Every structure is written in C-alpha cells, then in structure tokens.
Symmetry: D3
Subunit: 166 residues, 6 copies
C-alpha cells in the first residue's frame, strides 16, 4: 500500500509523525505531499522532508490518505489541487484517516454530508454544518473514514486505520 | 457606549489591542470578558487584563460586541454562555465587529444564515456552510455586522465599526 | 497627508501597528522607513514591510512623523540620516508623534531643549538632561510634538495626533 | 503486560509519545515514572502526566521497560533508584527498549558489558567504553534488549519491541 | 574587597556573569543586589540568586560597585534607593565598573558631569547630555570609574577594573 | 600564546565566552574553530564568529586548547579532524581546559585512561568508563589538563588554567 499525507507547515507534530512510523511498521510506503519540495516544520518544531508537491500527486497512484491536524489544514484546504486529491480518494472509497483539524480538508472537499465521524471539538460546529453526524469519541470508523480528535487518541486512531489497510 | 470583547488566551494580539484603543479614543468604555478573571496572553505575548467572566456578563448592559481572532475563538465557541452572549447581542441588532477567526463564535451562535461578511480565508468554507454569503474584502458591512479578514485590514475594520457606534 | 515612520528591527509592535492603521483610517498615506529595504520584525514577532530606506527619504516630501518605541530608537539614533530627517521635520513645525523610547531620536536630533513632553519613564532622566520639561501623563501636546509613554497610552496618543493632521 | 517508562523533563517528545501509544494499541498498560508527581515537558514542549515516582516503583510489578531519550537520561542516570530499576529489570531478562540517549541509564546500571546494541551516534564512544558492541543500525535486537538511534528509527524500534511482548 | 552589583531582571547575562566570576577569581566577595530576594533572569535566560535587596544595602559596607547592562538599568535607575547607593559609592571615590547601559544608573545619580567614559554607543547622546566626555573605546579609566561599551569589551573592562581593587 | 577553541552550535554560552575574554585579558590570542565559517549560536542565543574550520586547523600552530560544554561536544566528537586536534594537543602535553560536556571530545580522542579530572556529573559514568579518576570538585588540575563541571565553577576553572599559560 502507498499512503499519502496532505500537510504543510504548522502541522501538529505527533499527528503526522505517529501514523507515518506506525504505517511504515506494517511495510506500507508513506509519502508526504505539501505545497513545495523541501522541508516543513510542525507546531512544535519537528521538521520533515516533503516527498512531492500537490501538483505532482496523481491520486490514482495512492491507496490511502492521512490528514494530520494542526494549523496546516486551514492552509491546505485553500489549495484546489490538494482538496481535489482528498475529494477523489475519499469519493473512491479509499481508506482516509483524519485527526483534529485534519477533516477541514474533507469539509472543503464536499464529501462529508451524511457521514459520521469526529474532529477537534473546537470545530465540531463546522463539521455539523458540513452535514457530519458528529460524535465525541476517541475514534470513529464510518466505512472508509477513520476519524479521531486529539493526540491522546493516537493509539486508537491507528489501531482502527491499520485494520482498514489489511 | 459600552463595548464588550469576548476572547481568551491565544487571541491575535493586535486584533484585540487595536479596537480596544480605537474605541477608547472615541470615549466608549471597553470591557474584556473571558473564562476567568485575571490576565490572558495573546499569540505574540501581549498580556491583557480580564474585566469579567462570561458567566457574569449581562448582555443587556452592553451596546456593542467585538470578536478578535487568533486561536481563542475555537475555545470561546465551546462555551455556551459566551456563544449565547454573541447570539443575543447580534440578533438584537447591536453592532458586532468580527475579524479573522472571530466569526467562529457567530457560526456557533447560529446567527449567520443569510448574512454577508468575511473572515480569515482559511475558514471561508465554514462561514459559507453556516449560510454566509462570503466576500473576499478588507471590510464588509452587513447592517450591524462589520467583518474583516486579517491584521492588514485593521484600519478599514474599525473605520466602518466606529460609524455604527455613538 | 503623507506620514513617515522611522523605525527598525526590535520596534515595539503595537506602537508601530496602531498609529499605522489609525492614520490609514483617516485616509493619510503611511510610509515605513528603515535601514534596508525588505522587512523588519518587532519585539513580539510581527513583521512589517519597509517602504524606503533612510537614505532615500526626502523630508520635504512628508507632512508628519511618527516615532514608535522599542529597542529600535537606540539603533535609529546612531544613523545620521535618520536623525537629520527627524531634526528637519520637527524643527520645521511638522506634526511629530513619539511614544516610549521613540523620543531618543529627538534627543539625538538636538531639538528638545525647552519643550514639554513625556516618554517611557525609564528614560525620563535622559529627556530631562536634553532640556525637556518631563511630565508623567498618558499624552502631552506641545505644539507640533505629541508624546506618550507606554502601549496603554495608545488611545490618547493618536486621539491627540489625529487632531494635528486636521 | 505492564510497561514502565523511566523519563523526566526534556525527554525527546516523540521517543516517549510514539512507544506510549504504540503499546497502548496492543492493549498493554503503560506507566510513566519520573522524579515527582505532576507533569513533565519534552524538548519540543509536549506535556505528559507522571503516573508514579521512582521511589514508588516496585520493578517486580512491571513486565517491560522503555527508555526514551532526550536530555532526560543524563538526569535519570544520577538517580540511584531509577538506575536500580533499570538494572533489575534488564538483568532479569525483561524486555527493555532504548532509543538515542536512553541507554545512558543502562550504562549507569552497569549491565551493558558484552551486549550488542546502538544509540545516538553522539554517545557511541560511551557505549563502546561501557562494553557494548556498537552497531550503526536502525534497530538492534540482543535478547531482551531492543535498541535504536534516532526518531527516524521509531517504526523499526517498536516493530521489534512489540514482538518481544507477545 | 566586597563588590556590590546593582542589577535586576533583563540584565545582559554575560555582563553580570563575567565580572562576577572574574572578581571571585581574585578572592573578592561578590554580592548581587536587586529589588526583591529570590532569583533574577537575564535577557538570555541565565538565572542568578539575589543576595540582598536595595533597601538592605548599606553602601559603607561595600568596597566597589559593578553596573552590568541590559534592560535592568532603566528599571534600577527609577529606584531612589538603588540610585542613592551608586551616588554615594561613586562620589566617595570607590571603584565603579560600568558597561553598556550600566551607566544609566550613574546618569540618574547625577555624578557624571566633567567625567570621562563610555557606554553602549546607543546612549552616547544621553551620556553627553549628562556632561560626560564620551570616548569610543573598549575601556576607559577615569579615576575610580572604569567604563566599557559592549560584551566584546569584557576582557579589557575587567583587566582594568581588577587593577583598581589591588 | 595562541589558544584554540573547539566548539559548534549549542555550546554553553558562558562556558565559551568566559574563557574567551579571560584569556584575552592575559594578552593571549584566541581562535574559535568549528565545522564551518560564519557564526555559531549558543544554547542561550549568544552568537560568536568562527575563525577557522576544523579542516584548516594545524594543531602545531596553537599552544593551548579550550573545550566548552553544551550540546556542541556531542557533535564535535563525531568529527575525526576535530577529535584528532584534541588528541594531538592533549598528547603533546599542551594545556587543555575542559568544562561540563567538553571532555566528551577527550573521551573520543582516547587520551583519558589513567587521568584525573571532572565533568558534568551527568556524564560521570562515561568519564569513569573512559578510565578517568573522576572527582566531584569545582576544578581539577592533572598536569596539562584543567577540568571543571558547571558554569558555577568558571572562576576556579580559569584561575587554574591561566597559571599553565604563564
């Protein structure tokens, strides 16, 4: 499996680094996509290398999608290509894992109406206004969409996501 | 005029400090409400004194409302009392100034359907999903609601808001 | 009216940003002059664009002068061109607004003997030794010179300065 | 299984948080021991709750040991009780995972002579002088001792460690 | 000899720590005086213990005076007692070492007219307005007054000061 | 005398700056060597200019060696040229001053077996495993090697080291 991450500067550090390594443990290949080649830096100062830009991403070449939180989703969701990647992969039924502010990208992709999931509670109302049946739970599994709220949910988040890739 | 601010830790410093002094210049009384008495600190390290808590606010003794941005609105909008203050003052047609993430509180108050305004572009889709006719402009005036996007808009934001007050 | 700001890195953030937007509100054009083109960053991390260098400034093309505080004035006052700009505009009777450490530039310009004003209390003795009648007040108006002490004075500072610009 | 963490302020954040959640996913109980009850903060500013003090640890009540790195090991290795915990658990053949500066605690326990492992390259000379056959590899498995070097090794580090706990 | 330091929070770290240790090498006793007991923290984050408060200082019980720079002198020079200490010791001819912003305290003590010395170049004009013959030199010795400009001058500053205490 | 400093980014600021100026006071010439030309920045944010790279150092052109602490030694000790410089100067019996983590470089040079000295207590066991008779004292003098533990020891450290360069 090839796993794509859509992220940018000001990502929540552990919400990117934890699924990155957890999926590598399984032997999946993990790819970080962002605006520009080079490095990006998290809220807490961890730097990670960008593997490819949004413009170079063909969503048909990836099997699953991870959306870390932080402040990066509010910039990534203004990128028509990045939102388009999320829309197609989510629409095709490929596994999509979101945590915290991550699902702001899915809101912008227009794919969440009638779906069930969670997010950082601070944006629950925006999830609800997008048509999500929002629940306060450490992990929600709604078909291909695995969603969690905060870094304390990491263990449950990837426990469920890893099952979807098996 | 008595002007109420709803804010918290991690407010955007100049988005609070600028209207605070701009409205003081006009002779209005300005009040900072937050979760707890004491002080709150902005994203950039400015400290501000809290005048009263959300719980102690009677919205009928205030004439106008200011909603600065930063990360504070995502905390403030989870406080039922703070959201009701904004809902009541806005629905009564009292002047309400919002900037950046400030209008997340108005989203949560359920008052934006059919209204016209702007915000930090990063949350445009959330404004639109709440029923806002979202405009990309340095300042928008929709009756009692004066909205702006980013600190570069400060001059235009209060230029319009000061007109609504007396 | 064209309003010039003389400043540099380590400016006190709100002492620059507040009058910048307050005077823009009136429709005045505002210009930031510093050592180099590019950007400068305040004590608290706000960045602002430099419009022109001290060397490119013709003081005859500007109508008023604003001197924000911070650590920048102790650097600007060593620049002979910057001090000559302040000397020429102040002695010509053009409106000059200073706050906090701002008037260190006026001290070095040699224009303060016999004047009345205020500053950050920490440099009260240096103002006095320059011949200033130093007053502990939120704003002082001495002809063309409007002076204040600290960020808490911003509202009164620009309230008085805006009057001088009509 | 009950898994014990020995750590303190200035731990390398992901080197604690990653194995913490990875082992929770398996259903193991994880416990953070440090000098004082309360919270500890990592190099990058993440806060974690301390479950018990070194004084309260009975090593017979735990099945495995994790030693995150950062600057914390250099303080922990001066604590006679913490070093004793590591000495007893490692010598008993219980699974011990160390990464980066973590094995400085094992150096101080005097248990590494004749063993094979890795560490932050910066302390390879100290590992070698303690009697370690030092290997430059993302993960080494030497009986009960699973060692890795840097955050980039996290996926391999816990891949091998979880096998030992089954 | 007993050497007294007058300083406070935001002292320039090496301008305090360097003479502190340099004079300890000679066998002198060194005392840190500030506003309150406890610790004070320099601009760069070093902490030092306060030995006594300004109120408790009897100037006749100390043989020499050191005035480090930073932002502490602008606060110390507003304390009538601290300024009184400096006034008495300097006017009595006891050795006084100042660097950077340090001499702002001597300016406020009113003892510098007719004297020869240096300072951080940024306050040169304030020194001159206090009546100082200001010299751009790494160290100046004017009787009991040993003055320097910046941290790069430290070696010369204490080279001259230790001679005065022999 | 020409004194060489081996250091890098994240040096303990006062552990470099203090001996730098103390030895300049004696009239010695002081040289900062690091990985690259330009500047390096200490843990506390002090900036110092690099005089030459490790690659350009001819150890025969220097009379004495200073090894400040911080986190720089853990990177410096991985550079074969830097370690060879310390090994050769120490082996020639030239004066070598180390403090805190400084002696990690000497550990890596393999020159400490049978020698007597001290270090940051946190690496006591690594010094002992390198063959050092470790002493808990503010300064130790073992022939050409003058060693100390922490910034609090600075006065005694250079008190003893300066004697070796007379």
């Amino acid at each position: 499996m090839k796993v794509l991450f859509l992220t940018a500067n000001e990502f929540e550090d552990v919400e990117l680094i934890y699924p990155y390594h957890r999926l590598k443990e399984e032997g999946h290949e993990v790819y970080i996509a962002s605006f520009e080649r080079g490095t990006i830096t998290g809220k807490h100062g961890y730097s990670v290398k960008v593997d490819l830009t949004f413009d170079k991403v063909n969503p048909e070449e990836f099997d699953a999608l991870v959306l870390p939180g932080g402040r990066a989703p509010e910039r990534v969701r203004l990128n028509e290509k990045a939102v388009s990647i999320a829309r197609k992969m989510f629409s095709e039924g490929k596994p999509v894992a979101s945590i915290c502010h991550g699902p702001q990208i899915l809101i912008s992709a227009g794919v969440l109406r009638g779906r069930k999931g969670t997010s950082y509670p601070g944006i629950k109302d925006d999830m609800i206004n997008a048509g999500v049946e929002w629940v306060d739970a450490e992990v929600v599994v709604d078909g291909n969409w695995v969603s969690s709220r905060v870094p304390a949910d990491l263990y449950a988040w990837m426990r469920e996501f890893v099952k979807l890739l098996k």
